[PDB]
Amino acid sequence: GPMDRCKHVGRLRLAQDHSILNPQKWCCLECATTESVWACLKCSHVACGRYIEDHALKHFEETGHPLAMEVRDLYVFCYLCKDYVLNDNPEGDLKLLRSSLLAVR
């Protein structure tokens, strides 16, 4: 299995309101694109990635929130590791979020 490469997953705590599973919220809070949609895993921010204007990075630069998930591709990027994340917490929170996003699509 994956090594526990991202040390930021250990303290990940996902919101309980299932809010990101709502596709009506899949659009960038800064420029309103629906093309590239990265949901912050610390707060309810949603913002575009490098394909558009990388407002997701701008969010990290303004808040330090380190983890975001692309709601269609299911990639998780860690802005402190500067890499994509394949390891999960013991509760399997990232897998469940990914599986749930597959399901609501």
Q: Are 75 and 98 in contact (CB under 8 A)?
A: no
Is 65 a binding residue for Zn ion by CB under 5 A? The answer is: yes
Number of residues that bind Zn ion (CB under 5 A): 16
Element at 83 (helix H, strand E): strand 83-84
Distance from C-alpha of 79 to C-alpha of 96, rounded to nearest angstrom = 21
**Nearest approach, Cβ of residue 79 and Zn ion (Å):** 8
Q: Tell me if 27 is assigned to a ligand binding site.
A: no
Q: Tell me if 45 is assigned to a ligand binding site.
A: no
> Which residues of the shown chain bind Zn ion in the complex (CB under 5 A)?
6, 8, 28, 30-31, 40, 42-43, 45, 48, 53, 55, 65, 78, 80-81
